[PDB]
Design a protein around this ligand. Structure first.
Ligand SMILES: [Zn+2]
Ligand SMILES: [Zn+2]
Ligand SMILES: [Zn+2]
Ligand SMILES: [Zn+2]
Lengths: 144, 146
């Protein structure tokens, strides 16, 4: 069981914490936490390739795409590893997140440790995905 | 991984950017950048185990020590993987960093990506369990760079 965590921050009101837990080698990755200050509705949710916050979320590069596949949704075969779809903010601007994903990993080639988790301005249209600006982001770190 | 980067921030004026480059996976790592807002003199410089900044620098946990060694300085053989010694800030509070280390790595079981780089209030005593370098002034998670 490996664990990771990400503190999402940006230049506006969006902020939150997302936890990752992988009980087994190459096993499903639980992803859960809360993001607040969002506009009500859907927000694109992506792992971007670089854990580089030197230029804020802009330096995070493109979607984590180690397999040079096309963009899609977490249910799509043809997707980027970093394609986690959308989070939904409630009427109070809070997106309580709880999913499971089998394409990301906390080990090996699909590993997301050291990359950047990003929450977006708009919905991902899921097949990039036209989710608009990168509102908050953080480097995915190893957690106890 | 051949390059990594870390943005150091805290609650005070200390801030900086540190870059890592490792040409060969079994070779040394070059570490370079600049930290500003420091008091003049030596400041402990460590990789802590967890890349968890949910509680700022405190949640980074202890020195990264996957090889079960005792605390030392970077040129000691008895050291933690995270023991990068001290950075030195000049009279303007600026610590220019440019070193090479052969214990940290950007891959494998000495890998420091996804862990926390920390700069401290005062000097690491280099072994003469933590080095007594005082509070954690700034930190960041070490991320994969292009
Ligand atoms: Zn994105
Ligand atoms: Zn994508
Ligand atoms: Zn320390
Ligand atoms: Zn140590």
């Amino acid at each position: 069981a490996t664990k990771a965590v990400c503190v999402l921050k940006g230049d506006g009101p969006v902020q939150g914490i997302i936890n990752f837990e992988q009980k087994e080698s190459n096993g499903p990755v639980k992803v859960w936490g809360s993001i607040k200050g969002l506009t009500e509705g859907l927000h694109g949710f992506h792992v971007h390739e670089f854990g580089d916050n030197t230029a804020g979320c802009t330096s995070a590069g493109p979607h984590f795409n180690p397999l040079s596949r096309k963009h899609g949704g977490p249910k799509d075969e043809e997707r980027h590893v970093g394609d986690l779809g959308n989070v939904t903010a409630d009427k109070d601007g809070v997106a309580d997140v709880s999913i499971e994903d089998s394409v990301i990993s906390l080990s090996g080639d699909h590993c997301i440790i050291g990359r950047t988790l990003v929450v977006h301005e708009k919905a991902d249209h899921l097949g990039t995905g036209n989710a608009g600006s990168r509102l908050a982001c953080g480097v995915i770190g190893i957690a106890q």
